[PDB]
Amino acid sequence: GAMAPSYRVKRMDIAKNDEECVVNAANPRGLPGDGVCKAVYKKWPESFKNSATPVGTAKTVMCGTYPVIHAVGPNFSNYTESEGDRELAAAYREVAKEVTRLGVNSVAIPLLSTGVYSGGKDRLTQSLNHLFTAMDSTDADVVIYCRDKEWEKKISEAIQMRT
């Protein structure tokens, strides 16, 4: 694992990450999708072979030797706040298992269910806190990728607050 495991945030395309593996904000059917998922499909299309997996799970498919961890967050348009919150926590716990199994020293990760699956709500804090609950026990360097300038500041602050 990393010598001093850290969290960092960068405002850039996750398809251009500098980490040993990537988490996709996938859909359950392994379709090219939108946003993060479409950028991952363009960069690592080979990783979508048998990538379909249920809501609240993660499935890893290799693009050459580069791992892509397909994590399926809930679409809060379809789920109740209560059940959606449970599936969103579960998807991140499955990401932590896969990162540990792969023995990577670093992982690039988006905030699950904060885009078209947000059901029109700001879910920065909800999603980021479930990311921390899952990843805190792992020793990989975690690099969170976002698009919005205000989200970059809020994620950076939330990381710094824990020290």
- Residues near ligand 1SQ (CB under 6 A) are 11-15, 35-36, 39, 110, 115, 145-147
> Could you say whether residue 102 binds Cl ion (CB under 5 A)?
no
Task: Tell me the closest approach of the beta carbon of residue 160 to ligand 1SQ, in angstroms.
Answer: 21
Nearer residue to Cl ion within complex by CB, 7 or 151: 151
Task: Tell me the closest approach of the beta carbon of residue 119 to Cl ion, in angstroms.
Answer: 10
DSSP secondary structure of 93-132: HHHHHHHHHHT-SEEEE--TTSSTTSTTS--HHHHHHHHH
Among 13, 81, 139, 157, binds Cl ion (CB under 5 A): 13
CB atoms inside a 10 Å sphere around CB 122: 11
CA–CA distance, 128 with 31 (Å, rounded to integer):
25
Q: Are strands 66-71 and 58-63 parallel, antiparallel or unpaired?
A: antiparallel
Nearer residue to Cl ion within complex by CB, 139 or 148: 148
CA–CA distance, 148 with 163 (Å, rounded to integer):
23
From residue 135, alpha-carbon distances to 92, 96, 107, 156 in Å are 8, 6, 10, 16
Residue 117 site contact among Cl ion, ligand 1SQ, none (CB < 5 to 8 Å, cut-off depends on kind): Cl ion
Residue 110 site contact among ligand 1SQ, Cl ion, none (CB < 5 to 8 Å, cut-off depends on kind): ligand 1SQ
Task: Tell me the closest approach of the beta carbon of residue 5 to ligand 1SQ, in angstroms.
Answer: 22
Place of tokens 């921390």: 132
Residue 151 site contact among ligand 1SQ, Cl ion, none (CB < 5 to 8 Å, cut-off depends on kind): Cl ion
| Type of residue numbered 12 | M
Q: Which residues bind Cl ion (CB under 5 A)?
A: 12-13, 115, 117, 146-148, 151
